[PDB]
Amino acid sequence: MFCVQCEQTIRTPAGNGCSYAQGMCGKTAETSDLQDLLIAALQGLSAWAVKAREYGIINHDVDSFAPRAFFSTLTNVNFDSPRIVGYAREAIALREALKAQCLAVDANARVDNPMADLQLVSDDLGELQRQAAEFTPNKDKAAIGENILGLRLLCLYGLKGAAAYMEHAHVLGQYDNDIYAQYHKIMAWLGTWPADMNALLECSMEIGQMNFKVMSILDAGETGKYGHPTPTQVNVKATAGKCILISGHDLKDLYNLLEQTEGTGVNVYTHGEMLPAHGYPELRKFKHLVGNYGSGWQNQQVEFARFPGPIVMTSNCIIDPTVGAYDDRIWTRSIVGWPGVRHLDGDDFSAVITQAQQMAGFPYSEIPHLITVGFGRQTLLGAADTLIDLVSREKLRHIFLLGGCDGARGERHYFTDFATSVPDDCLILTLACGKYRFNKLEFGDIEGLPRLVDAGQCNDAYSAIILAVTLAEKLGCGVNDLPLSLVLSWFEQKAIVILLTLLSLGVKNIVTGPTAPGFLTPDLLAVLNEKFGLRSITTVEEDMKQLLSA
Ligand code: SF4
């Protein structure tokens, strides 16, 4: 068992990632090995899906399936082993079903597909299954250059994050077929174990390109489904009676859970990456979504435990529910999976509504306290020519992007401290669950424009990127001539992929912490420090000064 995709892998002097028996995040050898097999099935599929060789044409099913499956191998998404084997099941079903369509035409020359992952068919039963040992991401650990492995992983791990966005784009109603072609090529090529440090870097930038396309399209879905987030204040206190809290990234599930509970008199609370839902007008319309509860995925355990009603996990950042003994009342949706905790497929929430009604709910409201959220792609560009004014009257000193995931380690204090200690004459543009790091602390404004400007969700770095571009557009300059640096936090594959696209956009002088990834060797991350000056955090006061100045 070996993977290292999260900011929280095993972290040791010798080596990088989690091997051993279990993950740090609760995945077992079983899963994390089975997940490897699913990735291999998946990669083969994608190689046959690259099979519109001249005009072999495309099946939306395969296209639209591949990300959704890959998404399950993601961190804190899925830890139920059967589910994962089953994703592999139907990957191969469609590789085979796919093969037939092309095979009625020219009998695939000499080789239908020259592929490592090939047909990759499999035998049955889980424990006795795990022959995925042949597929682990580092079977050639020392049989390939260690720096080649690092680029390789950051290429796959990265693409993973992109697929998450492809899906929770798709689901919100949008895809593109050229993107799908690019997905499959990249996945197909990653299938074939190959490692050429030149093309790994160069196909780690192209993932960046693609990820932007798809974040393009996913910000396209959110705006079109539920409006353009306009700036909006959210209560983070508890209120009144019975409640269901919904966590994760899928706005669809909240719009449904909202209609279904419409005047049922049970209330909706968001948590984690569901916060920025609140800014969306066709979603904030509801009088029952009361507030937003708790903070940061890193502590579901002790907070979900305290929340009266049931919890609905839309996607990602789920951990072991057994600890807080709330496993009866967590409902995994979509591709989220945890063994033995109820999975709610279908768009019928009434199961969990009635469950919410059985429970305590809240005993009162607390004296409320609101934060401000939903600086939309739209509403951010709204700000720009006033950002440029404020800067152009030495009112706005420089803009700071405190961003990316929350994790668990105390070393994350950095982000909180960084944020308060940003000087009183410059903005924060935050955008992720690490928003929760400094999010409820007091910030003030610069002439009305709030100093803490939430942009929404990890997936909304696309918003942040686009603000910068329109600032560079406007100030006749270039993206890092801009008076903004980026001090991003990170935890999983989506934030890897945002780093890729940020790098691919060519934004130089990024500051990931609170540590840098497990598969980036001091060599390699020094190569990134060659090409893009990407440096780690480690110190709040130093890094403040470095960044303010010319
Ligand atoms: S998800 Fe992260 S913590 Fe869990 S096994 Fe994989 S790398 Fe380790």
Curated annotation (Swiss-Prot):
pH dependence of function: Optimum pH is 9.0.
Regulation: Inhibited by oxygen. Activated by cyanide except in the prolonged presence of excess cyanide, where the enzyme is inactivated.
Keyword Iron-sulfur annotated: yes
Cellular location(s): Cytoplasm
GO BP of this protein: nitric oxide catabolic process; response to hydrogen peroxide
Residues annotated with Cysteine persulfide modification: C405
Cofactors that this protein relies on: [2Fe-2S] cluster; hybrid [4Fe-2O-2S] cluster
Lineage top rank: taxon: Bacteria
Assigned EC number: 1.7.99.1
Positions that bind hybrid [4Fe-2O-2S] cluster: H249, E273, C317, C405, C433, C458, E492, K494
InterPro entries (alphabetical): HCP/CODH, Hydroxylam_reduct, Prismane-like_a/b-sand, Prismane-like_sf, Prismane_a-bundle
Main location: cytoplasm
The reaction(s) this protein catalyses: A + NH4(+) + H2O = hydroxylamine + AH2 + H(+)
Induction: By Fnr, NarL and NarP under anaerobic conditions in the presence of either nitrate or nitrite.
Positions bound to [2Fe-2S] cluster: C3, C6, C18, C25
UniProt keyword list: 2Fe-2S, Cytoplasm, Iron, Iron-sulfur, Metal-binding, Oxidoreductase
GO cellular component: cytoplasm
CDD domains named among the record's database cross-references: HCP (cd01914)
Record text on cofactor binding: Binds 1 [2Fe-2S] cluster.
GO molecular function: 2 iron, 2 sulfur cluster binding; hydroxylamine reductase activity; metal ion binding; oxidoreductase activity; peroxidase activity
Enzyme class, broadest EC rank: oxidoreductase
Family: Belongs to the HCP family.
Function comment: Catalyzes the reduction of hydroxylamine to form NH(3) and H(2)O. Is also able to reduce hydroxylamine analogs such as methylhydroxylamine and hydroxyquinone. Might have a role as a scavenger of potentially toxic by-products of nitrate metabolism.
Protein's name in the database: Hydroxylamine reductase
Organism: Escherichia coli (strain K12)
Gene field: hcp
